[PDB]
Design a protein around this nucleic acid. Structure first.
Ligand code: MG
Ligand code: MG
Ligand code: MG
Ligand code: MG
Ligand code: MG
Ligand code: MG
Ligand code: MG
Ligand code: MG
Ligand code: MG
Ligand code: MG
Ligand code: MG
Ligand code: MG
Ligand code: MG
Ligand code: MG
Ligand code: MG
Ligand code: MG
Ligand code: MG
Ligand code: MG
Ligand code: MG
Ligand code: MG
Ligand code: MG
Ligand code: MG
Ligand code: MG
Ligand code: MG
Ligand code: MG
Ligand code: MG
Ligand code: MG
Ligand code: MG
Ligand code: MG
Ligand code: MG
Ligand code: MG
Ligand code: MG
Ligand code: MG
Ligand code: MG
Ligand code: MG
Ligand code: MG
Ligand code: MG
Ligand code: MG
Ligand code: MG
Ligand code: MG
Ligand code: MG
Ligand code: MG
Ligand code: MG
Ligand code: MG
Ligand code: MG
Ligand code: MG
Ligand code: MG
Ligand code: MG
Ligand code: MG
Ligand code: MG
Ligand code: MG
Ligand code: MG
Ligand code: MG
Ligand code: ZN
Lengths: 104, 51, 43
RNA sequence: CGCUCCGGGGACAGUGCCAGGUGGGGAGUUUGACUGGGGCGGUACACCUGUCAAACGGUAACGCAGGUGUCCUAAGGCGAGCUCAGGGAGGACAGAAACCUCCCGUGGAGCAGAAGGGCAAAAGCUCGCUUGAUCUUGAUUUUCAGUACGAAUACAGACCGUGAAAGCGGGGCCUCACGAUCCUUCUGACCUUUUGGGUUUUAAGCAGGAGGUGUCAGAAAAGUUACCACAGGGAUAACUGGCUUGUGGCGGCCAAGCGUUCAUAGCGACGUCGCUUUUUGAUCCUUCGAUGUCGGCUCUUCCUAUCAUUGUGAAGCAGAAUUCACCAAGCGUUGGAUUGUUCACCCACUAAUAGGGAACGUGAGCUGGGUUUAGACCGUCGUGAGACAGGUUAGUUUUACCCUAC
RNA sequence: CUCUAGUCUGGCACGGUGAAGAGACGUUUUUUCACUGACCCGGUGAGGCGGGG
RNA sequence: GACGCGAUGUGAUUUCUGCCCAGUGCUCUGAAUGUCAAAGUGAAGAAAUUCAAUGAAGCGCGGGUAAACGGCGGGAGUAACUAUGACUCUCUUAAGGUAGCCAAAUGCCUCGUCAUCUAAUUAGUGACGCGCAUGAAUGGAUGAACGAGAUUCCCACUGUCC
RNA sequence: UCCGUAGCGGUCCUGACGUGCGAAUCGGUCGUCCGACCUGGGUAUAGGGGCGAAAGACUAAUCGAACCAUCUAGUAGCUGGUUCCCUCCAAAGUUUCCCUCAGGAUAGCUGGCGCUCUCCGCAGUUUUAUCCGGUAAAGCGAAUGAUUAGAGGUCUUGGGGCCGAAACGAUCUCAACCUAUUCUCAAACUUUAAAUGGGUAAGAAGCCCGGCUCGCUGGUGUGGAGCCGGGCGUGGAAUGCGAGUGCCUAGUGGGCCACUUUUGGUAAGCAGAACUGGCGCUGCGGGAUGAACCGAACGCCGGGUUAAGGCGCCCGA
């Protein structure tokens, strides 16, 4: 799909429609000191082998695309997540398609 | 599985050497002052077959 | 159960008889740590 | 006289503890489900359309024909202006088919896809402006237990877009396009806790998205066993027996033709009606706390769809030989080479060498050649253990003295 | 699938005595040549070892 | 103490043992180096911590090895009677099965075809090879002597049988 | 090395025996019998271990992991049993979810305990109004799809021409096309369109007037809704019946058969659905016999009469 890099939409902090910067959300790096990671690290220590399940029967091909929306206001600068439907191809702001032209 | 034949040889008690009729450990004379600074003389008594 | 070469409906090895040097006992049979395994031609 | 017993090594071999690699040598465990037996094959396992479906709704099968795990910054949202498919008649190059113009055109087009429904100053086409595909409570419908998820419908509170405005819009004209707990990650608040208090990192919470379980209400999971084991099942196959008769076998009706002439002496196409269970199927009703599973030998009885023989009718019956048909199962239907064979094929005799049933007659009657345990060899397949209605060889055949029948 | 004996390899300790050299930004890193005294092997009934005369 | 010990394959003698290192194994070489843990070093930070450089073996990279496991093609035209078809072309993989041998204990079709053995033979033997799916130490071919091994025929012998 | 005895072993008869002499023996026939020969005693190796001229053989009649004790009364969605009487009520093999398909949870069906009223309400039913449908049927001179035949047409182009060198000229023709007709069809076609069926209504929780409130809605004490206060009882179709309500709860979750409708299959005592009734759970009379068919359901008896069936004899008539 194709979405632009700018979208005028509601801001929760402003209470109004403001223009936004639209990027793509990506998963952050896993912290070693989250409670579940610490519990997993202490459970996997020693003998007994692998204790938690390891998922292997993957079926889906694409993820849901999340747009990271950021308020362009200097005071606000508030961000939020907005998910769209599953798509194999995704691009931020490129080749705005036209009508009645020659296909080459 | 079962322990294999080449593994069973290191335990012994069947695969030990048959040393009943052997004549002894064949070795050179131990080194001393005579064999370190000069020579010593000995005599060949007999030649035997070691099993 | 008796040897890693035993079994099968045909008397055959079924695996490369050349084996690595650091193999566990009960597996290290055949041709141990062999650099080449053929008829000696030349030197 | 001396200080290591002489040599050979030596700050390294080696030992203790961690770290990475390797590790079926060994240990533990797994190797889905549906299924006209199981396996192989498919997905009828989560969804959607038309039908089945018997005019509310609901309704099954490995029932039929299909589709889905996407695509779209517009193909979402308004507003404006047009009318599509196809056809006819014309116009230089121009022709079947390029472009212009007139007329007819109820949709015969298009609306992303499968199909169905719906739609003409539109829901289609082309433009202009846009982000209602935004935030936030509840309620409702669909599946349904009347629980969730998904999808959907009416509102309400805001901020907006568009249009002159009425209004319309919180995704796609509608019916599918999708995902719990635990964990992780991001976003939100001058938010709460971080423990005897205070500050600051950190961490734990609350709220909303995502990372995914397609066996789709969501275990983390390869085989082989003919060396096999247990609990069971006739809910389920391999024998017989049943129902059925596609297939096999047998018999009719009609008569275009064959028969030198001549449909019907003897045959008989194209059609059509039946019989039988000596063929194989289909099914799974009985039997898995066991009905001994192929042949052959032996022995008795029955059937007729009659090969011969008795008595006869008809011939394209001169005689001889041979065909068709009737009453008819009384009596016969053999000896051998090959193969475990059933079957088949050949030699010979004969009068004829007809077909079958009796738990595919007959293993406490035999035999054990085959099939069908464990030992082995070959070919193919598999990395392997091993597999092969593919060949080859060797492989324990128990008991009657009970009752009945004779 | 998840582990595991054994095995290979790296670090720390046992673990010292000197000489040189190469180093990165005077400590320390590491390479080589040696020493024996920890540690290891062989021999022997631990029998003439090292210097000097 | 290498004329030894340990680990495998094949299975006397005779005659041979062809081709393939692409795959999976085994082995060699290496600061010429991609990945790479702990420990150690450097920097920031109030510190917990974070980041970066260095980065052993092993994987990668390269060579050897088939008496290591194993493997060893397909389609057309072409000799002027028919056919077959040495020869050529083309597609190709690491080669494309060499010497031998065969309806074999290995061949579905198949009771293959021919010859012999019989009066008659799905049996036996000898040839033919298009070989579903033969083949060279996963050993090929042969072969005297030997065998309570499997199979065919003949003489003699007999109640196996009439 | 050969024949062959003692010894060692165990080919064949697939002999005997096979509740045997014997939990592996016996007879004849056989292999070997100077060497990888046979054998006593001592000794070594112990269970995921030994030992194996290799059969998964042997390891005290036990071997593809011996034997003894304990954990242990291991677990079993699986098999078999589960002990006195009478009375009353009385099922289900269906929905949804589950590595669910020989099992559970859930809803349904059942029972028990009651309670709140009675001494209006409710109904596996009809009538009267009012909606819904797309099956049976029918239709193809109505759309879509399939499909048979002639007939009349001009030039709308052609397949063969032919008299024209030739002209939309003569002029036959055959096919596509057009126009009225005609034969035959549709589970996934339809203009029409039943029977049976599915919803609502048939009053007092209704009508009727007056007044009040609203921050909703508005030109308008407009509209809408909610409150009070009164007035109307012939209780506004038939038939029948006392109802309403709350806890706890077992068993079941393999079904099968029949009229009609109906899917797959040539068909099946085949496989799979809908409706109702049965069998299962149920005896009785009849169909000779008999799960389901016809009649009719059941406390113990006497008299009478019937149903479905019958009335020569068995065997009542
Ligand atoms: Mg650890
Ligand atoms: Mg093994
Ligand atoms: Mg192989
Ligand atoms: Mg292992
Ligand atoms: Mg294992
Ligand atoms: Mg299954
Ligand atoms: Mg209906
Ligand atoms: Mg418009
Ligand atoms: Mg709103
Ligand atoms: Mg639209
Ligand atoms: Mg086997
Ligand atoms: Mg098997
Ligand atoms: Mg069993
Ligand atoms: Mg059954
Ligand atoms: Mg049967
Ligand atoms: Mg027939
Ligand atoms: Mg004629
Ligand atoms: Mg059934
Ligand atoms: Mg029985
Ligand atoms: Mg019997
Ligand atoms: Mg007759
Ligand atoms: Mg029989
Ligand atoms: Mg019998
Ligand atoms: Mg018997
Ligand atoms: Mg046999
Ligand atoms: Mg066998
Ligand atoms: Mg007696
Ligand atoms: Mg070899
Ligand atoms: Mg070779
Ligand atoms: Mg290689
Ligand atoms: Mg050849
Ligand atoms: Mg013969
Ligand atoms: Mg031959
Ligand atoms: Mg080969
Ligand atoms: Mg071979
Ligand atoms: Mg001898
Ligand atoms: Mg002898
Ligand atoms: Mg016997
Ligand atoms: Mg007896
Ligand atoms: Mg006696
Ligand atoms: Mg031991
Ligand atoms: Mg032995
Ligand atoms: Mg075996
Ligand atoms: Mg079960
Ligand atoms: Mg049961
Ligand atoms: Mg319908
Ligand atoms: Mg009809
Ligand atoms: Mg049925
Ligand atoms: Mg009942
Ligand atoms: Mg009854
Ligand atoms: Mg009757
Ligand atoms: Mg009475
Ligand atoms: Mg009667
Ligand atoms: Zn803002």
């Amino acid at each position: 799909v194709n979405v632009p890099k700018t979208r005028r939409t509601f801001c929760k902090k402003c209470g109004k429609h403001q223009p936004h910067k639209v990027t793509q959300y990506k998963k952050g790096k896993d912290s070693l000191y989250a409670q579940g990671k610490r519990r997993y690290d202490r459970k996997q220590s020693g003998y007994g082998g692998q204790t938690k399940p390891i998922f292997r029967k993957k079926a889906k091909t694409t993820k849901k695309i999340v747009l990271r929306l950021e308020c362009v206001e200097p005071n606000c600068r508030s961000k939020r997540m907005l998910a769209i439907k599953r798509c194999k191809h995704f691009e931020l702001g490129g080749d705005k398609k036209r009508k009645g032209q020659v296909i080459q | 599985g079962r322990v294999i034949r080449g593994q069973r040889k290191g335990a012994g008690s069947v695969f030990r050497a048959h040393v009943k009729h052997r004549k002894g450990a064949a070795r050179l004379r131990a080194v001393d002052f005579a064999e370190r600074h000069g020579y010593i003389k000995g005599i060949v008594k007999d030649i035997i077959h070691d099993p | 159960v008796e040897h890693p070469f035993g079994g099968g409906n045909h008397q055959h090895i079924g695996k490369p008889s050349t084996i690595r040097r650091d193999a566990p006992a009960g597996r290290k049979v055949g041709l141990i740590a062999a650099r080449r395994t053929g008829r000696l031609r030349g030197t």
